[PDB]
Amino acid sequence: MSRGSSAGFDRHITIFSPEGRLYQVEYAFKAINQGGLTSVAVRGKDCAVIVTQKKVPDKLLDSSTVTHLFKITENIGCVMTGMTADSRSQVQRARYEAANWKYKYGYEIPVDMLCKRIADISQVYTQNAEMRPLGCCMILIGIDEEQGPQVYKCDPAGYYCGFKATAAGVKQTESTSFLEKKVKKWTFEQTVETAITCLSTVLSIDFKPSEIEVGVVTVENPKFRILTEAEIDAHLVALAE
Amino acid sequence: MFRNQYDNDVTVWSPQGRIHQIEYAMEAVKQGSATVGLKSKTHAVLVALKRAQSELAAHQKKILHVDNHIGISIAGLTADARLLCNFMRQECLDSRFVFDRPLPVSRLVSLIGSKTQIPTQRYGRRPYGVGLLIAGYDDMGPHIFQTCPSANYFDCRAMSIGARSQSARTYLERHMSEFMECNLNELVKHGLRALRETLPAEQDLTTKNVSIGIVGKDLEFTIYDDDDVSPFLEGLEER
Amino acid sequence: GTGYDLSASTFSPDGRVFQVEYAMKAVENSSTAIGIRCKDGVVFGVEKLVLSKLYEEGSNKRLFNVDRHVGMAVAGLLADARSLADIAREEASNFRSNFGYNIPLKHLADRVAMYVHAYTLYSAVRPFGCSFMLGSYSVNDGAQLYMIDPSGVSYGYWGCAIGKARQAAKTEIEKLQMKEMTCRDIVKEVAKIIYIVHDEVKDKAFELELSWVGELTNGRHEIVPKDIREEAEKYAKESL
Amino acid sequence: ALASVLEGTTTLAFKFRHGVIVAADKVIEINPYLLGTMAGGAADCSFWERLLARQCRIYELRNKERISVAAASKLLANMVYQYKGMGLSMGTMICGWDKRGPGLYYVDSEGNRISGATFSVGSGSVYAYGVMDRGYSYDLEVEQAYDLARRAIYQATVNLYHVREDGWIRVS
Amino acid sequence: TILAIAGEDFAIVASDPKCYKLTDKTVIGCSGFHGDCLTLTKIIEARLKMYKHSNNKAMTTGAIAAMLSTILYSRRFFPYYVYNIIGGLDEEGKGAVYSFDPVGSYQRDSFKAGSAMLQPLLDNPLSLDRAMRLVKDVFISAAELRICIVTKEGIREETV
Amino acid sequence: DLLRKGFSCVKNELLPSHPLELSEKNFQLNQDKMNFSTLRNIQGLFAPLKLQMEFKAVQQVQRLPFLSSSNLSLDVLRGNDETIGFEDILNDPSQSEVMGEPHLMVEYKLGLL
Amino acid sequence: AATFFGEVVKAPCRAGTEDEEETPEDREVRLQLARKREVRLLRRQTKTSLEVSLLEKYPCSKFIIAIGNNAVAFLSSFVMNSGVWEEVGCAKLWNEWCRAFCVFYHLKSNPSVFLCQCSCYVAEDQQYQWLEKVFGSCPRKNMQITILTCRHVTDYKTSESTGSLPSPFLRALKTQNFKDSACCPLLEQPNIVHDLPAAVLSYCQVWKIPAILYLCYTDVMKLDLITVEAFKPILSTRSLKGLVKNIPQSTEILKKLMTTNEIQSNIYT
Amino acid sequence: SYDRAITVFSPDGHLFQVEYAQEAVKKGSTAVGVRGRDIVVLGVEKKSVAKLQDERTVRKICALDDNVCMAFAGLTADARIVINRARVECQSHRLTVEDPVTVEYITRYIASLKQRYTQSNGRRPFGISALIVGFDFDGTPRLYQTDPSGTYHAWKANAIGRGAKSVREFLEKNYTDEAIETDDLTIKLVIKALLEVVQSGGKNIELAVMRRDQSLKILNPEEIEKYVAEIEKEK
Amino acid sequence: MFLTRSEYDRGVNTFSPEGRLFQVEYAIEAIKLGSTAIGIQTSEGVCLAVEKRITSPLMEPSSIEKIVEIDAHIGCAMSGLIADAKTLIDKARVETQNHWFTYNETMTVESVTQAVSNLALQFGPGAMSRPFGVALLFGGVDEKGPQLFHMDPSGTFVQCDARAIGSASEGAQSSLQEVYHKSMTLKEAIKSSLIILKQVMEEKLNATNIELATVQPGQNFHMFTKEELEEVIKD
């Protein structure tokens, strides 16, 4: 590289602060809000639901080419928040890792194993002086053979955990508080309504069918599937009435 | 005053969206003597202006040889010119040896540009500091090209580069109308007349600082020096 | 963002990379190129500034060909654009070799966008300084247009415009009926837009360069015939 | 740019107080001061003696002094020994006068390197060796030595050279 | 069959095999396997061009012979299947003919051939007309067509 | 030379002793070539470039070659952190019976020899 | 400025504050270095040295200074070709960039007219020593100073690209007491000049002495005919009126000088 | 401010890190060598006595082969690498040639090894200077000296280390053919030259000697004291 | 309107705002610390003269080799750092021997100069990161007449007729231009070169502080002996 390392307690990834704080990791964490959107994932009794915002401000764009819901495998779905190029690159890496695991072991990779592998890869970037962390977080949903629905999350620092209902984006704290309030006190229809109501209450939007996109997995149908405009509108009308 | 931090490297973008090392390298072509090139419907010629450090020295070579149908003229650094000439010779020899067919000038120039673009993006390197004029003949007719330190090439028809080349370029632009329907003698006369504009209006185009390279359909690349340029010079008029 | 903008692997306190922003600012140092997608084809158009009369007619071309079905228009640094065109040609040729049929435009755009983005992560290289468009047409797919950004993000467009004056160009593009016109009217509209957006005091003179790919060319990228270009120029000058 | 970042012949010889004399019935002139003998494959002999000659020239240029016979013979033996069992076939005698008196050496393709006083190889060389051993001495006359070599050649059945303190000459 | 004859002022090279021209004063004759001959000719041409570029001077006959010997001996454990004869005006007016072997050992001579004993024609000097007549007549006398005379004037293309 | 190396036969180096010698000596290189070819044919040019860049960056912070290293980050990236092969338990390289001079090996690594 | 992989480096400072602030041996070495770089004025024509400042021992009415090879050549060709001039003294220097080397003459017909020709480089710590040695501390009331200098065209600041300018061209900068006018436009706003001519002009401005400085911006900094000829309009000013008499002789001498310049390097071809 | 990189030139054409290595050499201990008619003598002056130390483990005179020996002055740790490298190279050349090494050959090899380490910013030079004496295969005595830059020269007699100017001046004044005739005369000359800068002698002097076909010999304090007393008797 | 500091000469791969790679210029300036060498070629041979500048009488004079032997008909000269010129002369000798082994011919002086210069123009495994601080001066006879060449740290060579490299290059070149004639013999050239050397050197020109060599078209390289220097100086 021959570019050296900048001098300062921040401004480099391999320098510890006088009380052992890495500041480039926190700045990468701040980089998630640059997109301006929010994501919500809720796990039901026998289903999982992903809901995220959609924002097209230009009438010259093609709305079919703007999306944030990806499909890593026939049984695993993902939603990305942060920089678009970084999100797409990380999706490609996840697909490659899943294919390699399938080839090496002989059966489809589990969601927790995929998240752990991605986090293990991401941890290396925070120790070397050549690479930089990606500014995005990934949420994975899937159906386990013996455990049921599963929701996971990863962050630029290399830390991953499994949840019951989590959120990411710009309104993460308010969404988390709402989710705790709901959980403390669920069929397929209740999970979608809960997620949509959480997003709408947090953002104060009163959504239209063309501003959200939903993807679900169920025990009866364990294949990741993206809901369509008619189904989203039907759910919104049922929620309103 | 704000340029200090943004012009020491070739992998750094200025806040205005500029790379200053490329422009600084481009400034180095104007450190050499002027050279002139032009073409016609059958022939392509190269004219250069040799310069000696003092009286007790031999003028350095400004026109090199690449292949039986390709020749170049240089202006700028010398090590870069030698490296580029070696690369061109190797490419032409390899193509001839393998395909038994001469390497086209367009492919040669594209290869040169692709090779030259690389050291302007990565660390630990610097841009090449030489500008080239390439003359060749192939199945598509005579050709003449120009090469920039910024890895850019132009398919010109009459161009001059070097120090104080503006007058020669103006003369060529004025007289480019009557170049296609000419033969070798008056083509070389036009080239010499264009090159004479560079010198101050007290000197003369003597037979000690002029190099001529000629390529054509049935004529291979040939370089004339010293007494060999006498037949091409008696017909010139006064200033 | 002074102090955090000397490398491509450094984050600002608000979480943004500034070398990429400088790279995207570098593209507004060149002329303006626009592209409009119509009912049955895609039409390109660029504004080329003449440097001197010595250059041959057909030098410094800014409209390339990838294969027999894909066009390309660039803006920004020329050398980077040439390298990216070579990469796109290599990708398309390799896909054709492996799979035996023409490559869809979306996959080509994805591959080139990821290759461009790969230069954003390391301190040993420099981000690209050029943005370009792609276009094609197939009987079972119709017209398709795409954008590539020095940051590495791609999108599908109905009308696009890049360069020095993209804002005004988009402003006049938005007041058009793209979905209910053919190429014959779109070429004239593009010429009119280019003539409107051009500034005369700063730039001495310019020459147009138009091209389309569509149904009437059987899905092949080609240069507009001279007579159509001349009549479009006359129409634009008269309307101006 | 990113991808660039990653990466039927009889010969004899003998020596005494007045230099070395070599006789035959070919002989290679390695140096104005070193003389060699060929036996076996012609191409191998020519190539390897040429390599030895250039290396000796380089050594003399570097050290500003002529090489020694023992060093040259040892260098040739080392160079040949690397390609052992590859089909090379040569038998050579290295003669010269550098310091401490004249020296004579023998070296072949297998790896033998013997320093002696009398040598003779090729076809019916046993008779020549016997007659030279019968007529050998240390203090003799130059004409006497020439006559002895001629008689040895005649009994075995002409090329004759003499090596002195300042080069070699051909007498016949 | 390849036959080469030297001379007082010119070199006579003939064949019925192929003959190639390397420069204005050298002619190469090859025989044997076709592919090895083609590869050897290509290598010789490439290195001739390299030397001309490096030293700004054409290669003489003796230098060509030395380079060819080095090339032939470069691959000794997998030898070629060729037979080369070099003939041309060497330095200052003397015809020079060089003989070769598949391993790469060479020597200079006056008469060399490649078709058994080719009527050596004891005694006979040997002017151009007489030498050409003898070269043409050897094959028809044997009863078992291209001549390229090299001289100071140049190289001809005589045919029979 | 001739003392820093010896007991080498040219004719005994062209012919391998066992069919498995070359395959075992160059297993990792062939595996990497196969993986890179498949990845490049499926996704594009960018993925092998990124992988090679990561490998090169990681492999550049180790001990000097006369002391054994752990190679943790490289094993994490490759995926060999949860598999044990025959290269790990047989003929441990941390207890080698021969080792050269420090300066000579450091110079040889740089390529000055 | 990184030698190995991962070294920590600090960015440079344009204000020159990197020296920080921080034994008799140190004093001795500092004194030795100071003595090694001391400006001294000597009388070259026999004798050893001088006592009092150069202008404090003679009366002056006009002072002409040339800095650089081009200005020295111009004055040698056009001014010194006629009349007789007597050398007064020379300056001895030592820098990392150096070693007519700062030689002073005056007209014999008019002993109140002085000319200087400095073709050497004077470091920033030797400017004021040069001023003290040459001028002194009691400036004369009635003097005229003309300064000539050459600078590269890449040092100019313009809205357009620096390669579009019709170089060479002249610019001027004069003190408030200069009641005359200039033959070239004055220097633009965001442009500054430093080093020795700046020191002389600042001294003249502060101590209220008329002065004027001329700058030539050229694309070639070696001995070239066009650069020297670019100074011609100065010959028509009142500063140099009774000092130029024969133009063709000056042109012939200039041609001979341009024939016999120097030996050159082998970097640029 | 051009002295913080090894491969960076000064505006007046100076490489300063090599000069700083020479300065590091300059502060060593004095070593003097004299080349005689049929003998070669070396000698160094000892630092603080350090009475509770084993004198065998610290020496500045070493033998490279049966006809070459060496003395140094500078950094102590760096010399131990060059000495081993030269020792290996001697035997390697013996295999290559069968003739004993030449003093010039071994000096050239050492100089090349020293030069190799002044060509990059990733390594630092060797801060030592050496004096090499020996006998050639023709029986001709020799004496050489190397520098951290990588240059060598042939001398009749010289000295290195701290306080070398006075020793060299004394050698220039008092070196001739009338004081080189005998081995005793040569040894007395070396001892006097060492005494010109050291304190009270006989306890701060280490001296070695090597004759033709006799190998290296280290003089003992008894012989050193005898020579010193003999000098003292001579007014 | 402020004044600031800018640095452009601390790296080899940095362009000044007007081209002007400054490190190469500094390397060229580093030649001026050497000793003056004069070489002029004539119709019947080429002459080379150079001063020695011996630092101490104890040094052996026949060890400062300022003129070397590239081959039987090619000479060389010295100016600048000594360590670099050794590794250039080794390349010259190896190339000129390889050419003979390959072709049975003698290399051209121009060809050997080009082969040498092909190595010194690459910088920035074994290649150095800084320019060579040495300037060479080839010469000899060939199939053409006597030839003289030149080379500087930038790595580019030019044919010439009269050169002067070292500290007194400017004055020596001025005197050479004043004195040189188109066609002289090998006595006026010798006299003029010795006169210029005696003028430029501060010390008196004796028979030991200088060195001379000639390459005549018939004979090979020959170096003048002490008696020849004495008889030339006396005349």
DSSP B178-197: GSSS--HHHHHHHHHHHHHT
Chain F residues with CB-CB distance to G5 below 8 A: 60-61
CB atoms within 10 A of CB G53: 17
Separation in Å, CA I235 to CA B31, I195, I204, I224, I229: 48, 11, 16, 15, 10
The range of the structural domain enclosing residue D56 comes to 9-172
Best mutation target, E53, E54, E57, to test chain B (most B CBs within 10 A): E53
Report the alpha-carbon distance of residue H26 to residue H32 in Å, rounded: 14
Distance (Å) from the alpha carbon of H164 to chain I's nearest alpha carbon: 13
Measured CA to CA, the distance from residue E27 to residue A194 in angstroms comes to 94
* Alpha-carbon distances of C120 from A15, C155, F46, rounded to whole Å: 22, 19, 12
Does B24 touch chain I if contact means CB atoms closer than 8 Å?
yes
The helix (run of H) or strand (run of E) holding residue A187 is: none
Which pair of tokens denotes residue C125? 């290289």
Q: Is H in contact with A (3 or more beta carbon pairs below 8 Å)?
A: no
Q: Give CA–CA dist A82/C167, Å, rounded.
A: 26
Residues of chain F neighbouring I126 (CB-CB closer than 8 A):
111-112
Is residue H18 within 8 angstroms of chain I, CB to CB?
no
What's the rounded Cα separation, in Å, for the pair I74 and I108? 9
Cβ-proximal residues to H10 (8 Å cutoff; 6+ apart), any chain: G96, H2, H16, I26
CB neighbour list of residue I229: distance below 8 Å, 6 or more residues apart: I207, I210, I212
DSSP state of B149: T
How close A2 gets to chain B, by Cα (Å)? 7
Instruction: Indicate the residue type of G158.
Output: T
Residues with Cβ within 8 Å of residue B3, at least 6 apart in sequence: B14, B20
* Domains recognised in chain H with CATH numbers: 1-235 (3.60.20.10)
Quoted resolution (Å): 3.0
Q: Which residues of D are catalytic?
A: 9
Q: What is the DSSP letter of C224?
A: P
| Residue D102 within a domain | yes
Residue B10 burial (CB count, 10 A): 24
Could you tell me which residues come within 8 angstroms of residue G165 by beta carbon, excluding any fewer than 6 positions away? G153, G156, G158, G217
Instruction: Decide if I97 touches D, using CB distance below 8 A.
Output: yes
CB contact under 8 A, D1 and C118: no
How many structural domains are present in chain C? 1
CA nearest to A12, candidates A26, A22, A3:
A22
Assess whether chains B and H touch, using the rule of 3 or more C-beta pairs within 8 angstroms.
no
B97/E42 touch (CB, cutoff 8 Å), yes or no = yes
Q: Among residues 63-92 of chain H, which lie with CB inside 8 Å of chain F?
A: 81, 84, 88, 91-92
Strand partners, I130: none
Residues of B with CB under 8 A from a CB of G: 1, 4-5, 27-28, 30-33, 53-54, 57, 60, 62, 74-78, 81, 163-164, 200, 202
Q: What residues of chain I lie within 8 A of the CB of H155, using their CB?
A: 58-60
Per-position DSSP letters for H88-135, written without gaps between them: HHHHHHHHHHSSPPPHHHHHHHHHHHHHHTSS-TTS----EEEEEEEE
d(CA I206, CA I54): 12
Q: For residue G168, is the peptide bond before it cis, meaning its omega torsion is within 30 degrees of 0?
A: yes
Q: Which chain H residue shows the shortest CA-CA distance from D68?
A: H99
Chain A: closest CA distance from residue F91 (Å): 26
Chain H CB contacts of I56 under 8 Å are: 158, 168, 172
Q: Which helix (H) or strand (E) holds D21?
A: strand D19-24
CA distance linking residue I160 with residue H38, whole number of Å = 50
Asked if H127 and H78 touch (Cβ cutoff 8 Å), the reply is yes
Closest-approach residue (CA) in chain G for B74: G269
SS3 E21: strand
C188: domain range? 1-239
Whole-angstrom CA distances from B61 to B161, G74, G268, H82, I118 are 16, 33, 12, 47, 16
Say how far apart CA A203 and CA D79 lie, in whole Å: 85
**C43 forms bridges with which residues in the sheet?**
C36, C212
Q: For residue F61, what is the nearest residue in chain A, using CA coordinates?
A: A128
Instruction: Flag if H96 and D75 touch (Cβ within 8 Å).
Output: yes
Structure tokens at A14: 């391999």
What is d(CA D113, CA H67) in angstroms, rounded to the nearest whole number?
27
Q: Which helix (H) or strand (E) holds H218?
A: strand H216-218
Spatial distance between the Cα atoms of D127 and D124, rounded to a whole number of angstroms? 6
Residue in A92, A96, A124 nearest the CB of F76? A124
Q: Which chain C residues contact residue F51 at CB under 8 A? A: none
Q: D–F: how many Cβ contacts below 8 A?
A: 17
**CB contact (8 A) between residue E104 and residue D43:** yes
Handedness of CA H11, H13, H15, H19 (dihedral sign): negative
- Interface contact flag, G96 H122, Cβ < 8 Å: no
CATH number of the domain that residue D114 is part of? 3.60.20.10
I32 touches chain D (CB under 8 A): no
Q: Which of B66, B86, B89 to mutate to test the interface with E (most CBs of E within 10 A)?
A: B89
- Please state, in angstroms and rounded to a whole number, the distance separating the CA atoms of residues A11 and F48: 29
Report the topology of domain E1-160: Glutamine Phosphoribosylpyrophosphate, subunit 1, domain 1 (3.60.20)
| Paired sense of beta strands G211-218 and G145-152, if any | parallel
**CB contact at 8 A, H153 and I64:** yes
CA of I5 vs chain G CAs: smallest distance (Å)? 5
The position carrying tokens 């809720």 is A42
| D1 inside domain | no
- How many whole angstroms separate alpha carbon D41 and alpha carbon B137? 51
- D42 marked as binding residue: yes
Spell out which residues of chain B touch residue E49, defining contact as CB-CB under 8 Å. Answer: 93
Beta partners for C40?
none
Instruction: Give the C-alpha separation, G259 to B54, whole Å.
Output: 9
Smallest Cα distance from C148 to chain B, Å: 18
Name chain F contacts of H116, Cβ cutoff 8 Å.
Answer: 112
Laid out side by side, the sheet with H61-63 consists of H61-63, H68-74, H128-135, H141-146, H152-154
* Nearest residue to B191 via CA among B38, B89, B77: B38
Which residue in chain B is spatially nearest to E44 when comparing CA positions?
Answer: B97
Residue closest to E16 by CA, chosen among E139, E149, E141, E156? E139
The minimum CA-CA distance between B176 and chain I, rounded to whole Å, is: 32
**C133 phi and psi angles, rounded to 5 deg:** -125, 160
Name the nearest CA neighbour of C83 among C130, C39, C121, C50.
C130
- Other beta carbons within 10 angstroms of residue A22's beta carbon come to 18
Those residues with Cβ within 8 angstroms of residue H202's Cβ, 6 or more apart along the chain or in another chain: H221, H224, H225, H228
Task: Look up residue I101 and give its two tokens.
Answer: 């082994």
Q: Cα separation of C39 and C182, whole Å?
A: 6
Encoded tokens for A161: 């955990």
Q: Cα(C58)–Cα(B157) distance, rounded to whole angstroms?
A: 12
CA distances E121 to A161, C44, E111, E113, G207, Å, are 102, 83, 11, 13, 111
The method of structure determination was cryo-EM
For residues B214 and B209, what is the distance between their CA atoms, to the nearest angstrom?
17
B-proximal residues of E, 51-80, CB under 8 Å = 53
**Which of H98, H106, H108 should we substitute to test contact with D (largest number of D Cβ atoms within 10 Å)?**
H98
DSSP string for residues in E76-116: -SS---B--EEEEE-SSS-EEEEE--TT---EEESEE----
The secondary element (H helix, E strand) that includes residue G78 is helix G69-78
State which residue of chain I sits closest to D63, comparing Cα positions.
I69
Testing the interface with D: which of B118, B120, B125 to mutate, by most D Cβ within 10 A?
B118
Q: Which residue in this structure is represented by tokens 């601080």?
A: I133
Are I152 and I84 within 8 A, CB to CB? no
Chains G, H in contact: 3+ Cβ pairs under 8 A?
yes
Q: Which residues contact C165 (CB under 8 A, 6 or more apart)?
A: C32, C197, C199
Q: Residue A121: what are its φ and ψ, rounded to 5°?
A: -65, -45
Asked if C29 and C189 touch (Cβ cutoff 8 Å), the reply is: no
H-helix or E-strand containing G38? none
Decide if D78 and H96 are in contact by the 8 Å CB cutoff: yes
Residue E126 φ then ψ, to 5°: 55, 65
- H chain contacts of residue D75, beta-carbon cutoff 8 Å: 96-97
CB-based burial, G60-90: b 16+ in 10 Å, e otherwise = bebbbbbbbbbbbbbbbbbbbbeeebeebbb
Assign D12 to helix, strand or coil: strand
Which residue of chain G is at minimal alpha-carbon distance from H1? G19
Q: Do I162 and B56 touch (CB under 8 A)?
A: yes
Tally of structural domains, chain D = 1
Using alpha carbons, select from A189, I124, G87 the residue that is nearest to residue B80.
I124
The pair of three-digit structure tokens given for residue I119, joined into one six-digit string? 């190595």
Could I93 and D51 be called an inter-chain contact, meaning their C-beta atoms sit closer than 8 Å?
no
H or E segment to which residue C119 belongs:
none
The one-letter amino acid code at G48 reads T
Q: Chain A residues with CB inside 8 Å of B123's CB?
A: 1-3
Assess contact for E104 and E70: CB atoms under 8 A: yes
> 3-class secondary structure for chain I?
CCCCCCCCCCCCCCCECCECCHHHHHHHHHHHHCCCEEEEEECCEEEEEEECCCCCCCECCCCCCCCCCCCCCEECCCCECHHHHHHHHHHHHHHHHHHHHHHCCCCCHHHHHHHHHHHHCCCCCCCCCCCCCECCCCEECCCCCCEECCECCCCCECCECEEEECCCHHHHHHHHHHHCCCCCCCCHHHHHHHHHHHHHCCCCCCCCCEEEEEECCCCCEEECCHHHHHHHHHC
| Beta bridge pairs of residue E26 | E23
Q: How far apart are CA C196 and CA A13, in angstroms?
A: 50
Please indicate whether, in this complex, the C-beta atoms of B169 and C54 are within 8 angstroms of each other: yes
Q: Check CB contact under 8 Å for I59 and H154.
A: yes
